[PDB]
Amino acid sequence: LGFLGAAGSTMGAASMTLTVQARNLLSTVWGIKQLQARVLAVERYLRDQQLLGIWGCSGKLICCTNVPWNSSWSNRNLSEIWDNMTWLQWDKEISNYTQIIYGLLEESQNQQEKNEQDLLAL
């Protein structure tokens, strides 16, 4: 496939092709439009990498975290999610309720880091 060839596929097929999208995020006075866009792309990529790094999650694509799944975010079962839904409708469903997940991971990683700090001292 290509750069976005798994966009129409389901989640169980698009999760195996996470490398192709992640690789292509970093590919005479009116030549400043070339210069203005590159700094924007670099800043957006650095923001994504920093936000991965806050959660203790950087360096990997598939990444697991011990925050429990609240049923108020999505009350449907896991059986229909990974083979009967694409990522676009998932972004549409959890366009809401995202900022609190991005803070729950933020606090949970610091709690895990301090628990590692206490265990490595005794």
Place this chain on the structure above:
Amino acid sequence: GFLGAAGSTMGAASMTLTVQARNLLSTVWGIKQLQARVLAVERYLRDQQLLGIWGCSGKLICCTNVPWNSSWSNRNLSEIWDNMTWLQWDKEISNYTQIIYGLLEESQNQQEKNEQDLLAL
């Protein structure tokens, strides 16, 4: 808030490292803003590279293997972490930082070289 624990105890200001860590990224207002954004990227990449040399990438709190010297600070645990702020600690150890940075670099340099020969089995 952003840095509302700047006057608090070092033992209580270490719970809130993320909300200072996440705001390093956020024609007159043309090339000036361009150099400002570029220099912000310079400072953030220099900080992350300096964490990358010491072997503490992706970690806010990182335990290391460098001996602490009593000549650096004779002042002990139960008051640095109980009734002292981070600004006073930065003023105290301000002219001792290059030695501990070089020692962290040396310890991480000697740490990785003792691992490559172990995985040759």
Place this chain on the structure above:
Amino acid sequence: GFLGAAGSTMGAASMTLTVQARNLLSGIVQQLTVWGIKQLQARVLAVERYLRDQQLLGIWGCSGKLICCTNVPWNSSWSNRNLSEIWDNMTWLQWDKEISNYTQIIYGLLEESQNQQEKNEQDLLAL
């Protein structure tokens, strides 16, 4: 210094890899005219080259390390020498010269191998 013992053996250069990587970004002393826009474009190009070098290390599971091993097979058509006659009495400048074409297949093999390894590690933790 920079590029020190570049003409030495690979074993001697492997102990000094940590001084090259400090200044692929910038120096701090060098952090509207002819020179200003040129220096700004040089800084932006250096940042992009450093991030492009780091992203490939990030994808293959090699992030945060200077020396690492990986679990993809190496075909013998790419190289035939054993370990002793490459890791002594050989310079890296002589070493890059014959893998100018075999590299792009190897990079994709690393990428797919790391993706499969991460999916297999994810599958084990669900039990």
Place this chain on the structure above:
Amino acid sequence: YELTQPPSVSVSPGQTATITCSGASTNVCWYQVKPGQSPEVVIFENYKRPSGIPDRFSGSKSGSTATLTIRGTQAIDEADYYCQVWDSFSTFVFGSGTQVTVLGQPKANPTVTLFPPSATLVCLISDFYPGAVTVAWKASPVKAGVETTTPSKQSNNKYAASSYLSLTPQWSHRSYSCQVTHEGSTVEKTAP
């Protein structure tokens, strides 16, 4: 305002000399003027002093009169001093001026001679110190058509001057004389 000053101050070397500048509401400023040289400011407020000026110069104000005090008068400190204030209508007004002279060599008396013409009279005065001198004439005094040389330093380093008087061949009167007054001392010489 007028900014009145005393005309002349003469002191012995090694002693103090004070000069006053009255009628000054606003802060005064003193300039030192030497012949052949540009003026230099010496005291630029009532009490302050700019860099490069020696320590012997100081000033003070009491009421509306401000005085300058020289601690030690050397041969360097022989000059003229003017005080300057600011006024709203005329922006800068200056004083009349005070000459400071040191007594390096002692007092002597002038020498004067009188000559008849062949009608102009000549009255030359030689070898006097200090340079403060006045010339008087009589015929009944004479108060018209008289011109006097300003006192100058000759090769002797001892001041000399001259005087002239224009007349008509009035040569009616029977007695002519040229009177020179030298800080109290009077020498008279006289005639048709």
Place this chain on the structure above:
Amino acid sequence: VQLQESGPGVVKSSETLSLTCTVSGGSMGGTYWSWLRLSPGKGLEWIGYIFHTGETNYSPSLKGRVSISVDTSKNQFSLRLRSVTAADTAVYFCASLPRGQLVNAYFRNWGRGSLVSVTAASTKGPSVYFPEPVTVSWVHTFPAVLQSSGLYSLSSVV
């Protein structure tokens, strides 16, 4: 900053005087460029200053016969007195003042001072001598007087 005047030394009576002070090693920004006059029979006096935008301020006793102009291109400023008289013989300085309040300001960066003599006489010889002082050698020699008509007279007695 060093200043130096330039101009004629002998000006005929009832003519227009002209002088030029040249500023070296400095700028025209924020400085009142003054002109000053030192007479032996009248003390030290003030003529006027000019600011670099052309705002002038002349002395009230000499108002109506004075004109000061600035020229930032050739880095200098000039003075013009009209209808000069024999009482205007003096030494002319150019000085400067800082921009601000003149309540405590004092003149600085003085020039060398060019002597200007306003005369009204012609060439004559000594009747034993206006353009040339006579040299009498045989003795003692006296400096020459200045008459009200504008002539000279000295004497020499052994």
Place this chain on the structure above:
Amino acid sequence: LWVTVYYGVPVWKDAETTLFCASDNVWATHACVPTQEIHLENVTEEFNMWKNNMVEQMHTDIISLWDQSLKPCVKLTPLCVTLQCTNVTNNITDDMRGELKNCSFNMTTELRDKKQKVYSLFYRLDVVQINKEYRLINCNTSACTQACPKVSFEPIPIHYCAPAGFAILKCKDKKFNGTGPCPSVSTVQCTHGIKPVVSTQLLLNGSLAEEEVMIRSENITNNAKNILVQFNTPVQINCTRPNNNTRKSIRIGPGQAFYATGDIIGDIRQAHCNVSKATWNETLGKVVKQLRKHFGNNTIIRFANSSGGDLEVTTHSFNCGGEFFYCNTSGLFNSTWINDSITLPCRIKQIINMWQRIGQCMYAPPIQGVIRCVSNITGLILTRDGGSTNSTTETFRPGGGDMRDNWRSELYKYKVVKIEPLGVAPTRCKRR
């Protein structure tokens, strides 16, 4: 269940960004980088071309690249002289009589001291009468620069290409309505190459529809919105200016030149333009066939000529060869629907202010020789009126005059999306 983090997920949101140029002159292709497509199977994306952000950015880009090309040329400030003009009658045609005026004026030479007496030729649309003494029409609003002869107004294709972190979605829908859902969306790096032509009533050298003639409007009920028509078979046209002008360089300054029209070599005739008859009849028949779907069956659809206004909006104005034409096009829109060639009386103006601005014109220098010129008519800009209901008769007149509508017929199948690679999902694993 526990939440997980996936990096590199294929989702996108609509956004606006900075699209840089790319190429294979007035349009500065020196700064453009030199110059692939991935099909997407099961996605439907909502498109909109009247809310598209690419057309406005392209229009501002075209204006700025026009403005930077006239900067180092001659200002032509001393040309505002009291002209002295008469008619020219070296065997002028009766339809051409009064259009060309011989003119003579006093002009400054290279030296600042002297002056010279210079004669030139000016069209009637350039000179105005002083109230025989004439003057130029630009000496009343703003004197303006001269187009340099080395640069050329030939429309080279340019590609608008998105930076890293963005994507451009291209519809493959063969019957695209112009807005709404798109059943088949394809992701391309960037576009096919757009020729930035300039026209008013008829679109020239554009991209053809591939199966049938498509007519697109923002609101077909409202009469105040323009109607864009895209053809499937092109209609060939001939530009023609049958005169042999002579350019002579008049030097008006130390290193500046004023290229003036010297004389006519031979006969003077009108600068007509020819379109075919039967091809235009068949194309207009297809157009009136399709428009009865939106407006109703057995409705009398007829075409009138332009309504009025200034010369730029009312007349067809193209730029082939280097001269500025202003053609009538009243024999094209005349029919009422229940080897001949249609010729058009066209006229030429020299002082041009293109992008609807006041106080900024440009003098076009004359071109030596005869100009032969052909192009394709692959698009029309119609505009209906406020006709009464239940009359079963509607009149359509060629509108135009807004430069966005020409480039909205090329960027009608594109949009810019912002890819975000971060997403969360629950599964069975737990971090150890």
Place this chain on the structure above:
Amino acid sequence: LWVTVYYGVPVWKDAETTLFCASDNVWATHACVPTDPNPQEIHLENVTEEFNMWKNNMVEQMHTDIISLWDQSLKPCVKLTPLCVTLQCTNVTNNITDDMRGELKNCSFNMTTELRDKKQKVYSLFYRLDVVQINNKEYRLINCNTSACTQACPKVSFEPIPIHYCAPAGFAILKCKDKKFNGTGPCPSVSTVQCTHGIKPVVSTQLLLNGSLAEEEVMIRSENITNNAKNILVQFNTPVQINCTRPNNNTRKSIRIGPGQAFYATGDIIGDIRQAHCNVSKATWNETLGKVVKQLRKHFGNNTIIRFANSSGGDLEVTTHSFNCGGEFFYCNTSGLFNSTWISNDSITLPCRIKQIINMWQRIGQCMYAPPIQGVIRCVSNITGLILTRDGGSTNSTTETFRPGGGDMRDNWRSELYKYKVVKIEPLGVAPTRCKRR
């Protein structure tokens, strides 16, 4: 003990950076970013930070930004180079009262037109401060011995609009909050903001106008109060309203000087010629001067005789109060205000006067021609400050004389940027503890 590395500690450092501004004209805010609704302010509890209002770098940055925007806004207007020729001005005399006599001149001169070869003969009314004599009498403009300068084209207005100075990424702005602050020394209560409050860049030389008031008392700030060469900024507690007006009904006519350039000139005045009045209430000014004298005695003594005298400048911008009132630049006397001697519906009128050729930022060879404004002109503003200057006679005295002054425009913006400081965040830090890496 063992060393650890912490990332993101709350440690700052003093630094200088290029701050960008945001807002909700000459100061072109179409290029600035829109600001946020509800700007968050975070109060820092147990902190003391050393401040200095006389050394912060954002004052010079603001001065450079205002100079750059005022230079940029005068680019596409009329150059007005061919105007100054040998003028021939006689006195206007229409229905003139006792004052403003010999002030307005009726000048006549040639000009060019649209066509190059034709000329015209036009007339304009010029003030006395714009023309100088060369030798009816032959006059000329005062500008073109140094430069011929651009007109301000009248679609751009001179009304000040607020700009908020933001902070870039990685830096922070610390805002003081103490109610009794002299601008130098430690501060007990320090807060941090994303951007400053609304700062309007007003231009004045003796009396600060339209500024930010105090909250408790009349504070007095100086770098060294015992030194007499430092300006003494005063911040008022209650504002004092000042009404300035121009009663002459002015007429503007447009003279076209080129193909696309027009010169707007003063026409005939309809009515009577009168001077520009400026009114300040007497009782409010007397109370405000009493408050200033009472606050001034805490720095000098309990028995010193504080006096006020009028200004002693050389040029017209330092001597006279100068501002703008919607297009006309005023130059006002203010000698009826600063005239008192304080021992231990009547309104004061001021003869405000108007100039047109304006050299405002004191750059050599750059000026500006302000066009006339049609009709009468009125403004209502309040005085929120002063720029005094002590006349230092001698030590241990009993009489202090204060005179107004200014000219340096950085003191007008140092009275609004005193409670602000920019810092650079350093997130790294090391500390000892007991833990071990495996």
Place this chain on the structure above:
Amino acid sequence: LWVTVYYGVPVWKDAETTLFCASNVWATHACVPTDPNPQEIHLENVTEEFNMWKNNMVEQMHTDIISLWDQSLKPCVKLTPLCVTLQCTNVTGELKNCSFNMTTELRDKKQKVYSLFYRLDVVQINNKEYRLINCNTSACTQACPKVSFEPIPIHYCAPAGFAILKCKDKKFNGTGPCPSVSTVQCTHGIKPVVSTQLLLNGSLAEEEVMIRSENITNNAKNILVQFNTPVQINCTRPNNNTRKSIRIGPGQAFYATGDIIGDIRQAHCNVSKATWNETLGKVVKQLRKHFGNNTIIRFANSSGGDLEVTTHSFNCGGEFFYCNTSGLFNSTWISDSITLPCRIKQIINMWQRIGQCMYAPPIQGVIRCVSNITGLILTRDGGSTNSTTETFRPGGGDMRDNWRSELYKYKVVKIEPLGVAPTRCKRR
């Protein structure tokens, strides 16, 4: 046997990139301060090739010098109404005494102002009417005199990730693989001198005199001879010039040449005789190793063309000399002082560009510069292979050959630190 990944290794390949400055017209204040004692490495087993003729550093240097010159000539006065008719006579026959009508700061008045012009920059219009020679091709700027033309040294540094090399081989002819390649942080003190057919104030050779060419067997490519000993050349303009300022309008000036104080004498630049003879002897001694060991080498004078390419040109103190230098290249080799009559022009078409001048203002007092010749730009007039004589006339006119005298021991490369290798290890 499985792939390992190594990062940070020293491996470079050749590439082009934009370098930056490190340290008047040449902007000193826009450069970063230089870096102190930049240490040097040695590659003991390298065979990396250099190239003097096809490196991108000379093109970038030429573009930067041109852009700096056009930037420094921007905020100065334009002399567009000075182009008037000139009535000139002879002085006391090279200098001209031209008088003209000229506008003042008042737009309606005019003044009559005289000035002195050289013969090289006036032309006669149709015998008392003249004009400048730029009045039909340009309208060109007077260089406002607060700037200087002094060749301050300029260091070029490489951006991050790029390194610039340095050949240490002494007998290196400019082309080919050298046994010894080094690496430096920044280039040395290159001074942008302006010269034609006599490279002066430059860097000497190591031990002997190098001969550098594309191919020695072609009569179209310049021969950059580089000396091992300096040949000192030193001279004056003996006239005493006064500078007057003529106001052209509202606040702009024009500095014209005033009256001559002393007596007029021509400029002359003289060089030592025995030193030049032994330097040319070294050149003809070692140059015979390329053309045949029994050959006749004779040096003719300049070929022809414009005055920029025919005559030796240099900006000594702000005045631009155009000295004859036909008394030096005149010999016939087979197995005291030399004076040069020199002339000065004012309006200058510098970088071979038609449409922009610059007007160099006159300077007061006498000027004197002592300089060292460190190179020649000889070209070969070819012919048939029938005779043993070869005529080597001087040539120039191309400013890149001045900057190919330097930038010969330099090359920029792009570091690629990522590299794979086969190993038997395993990641677990």
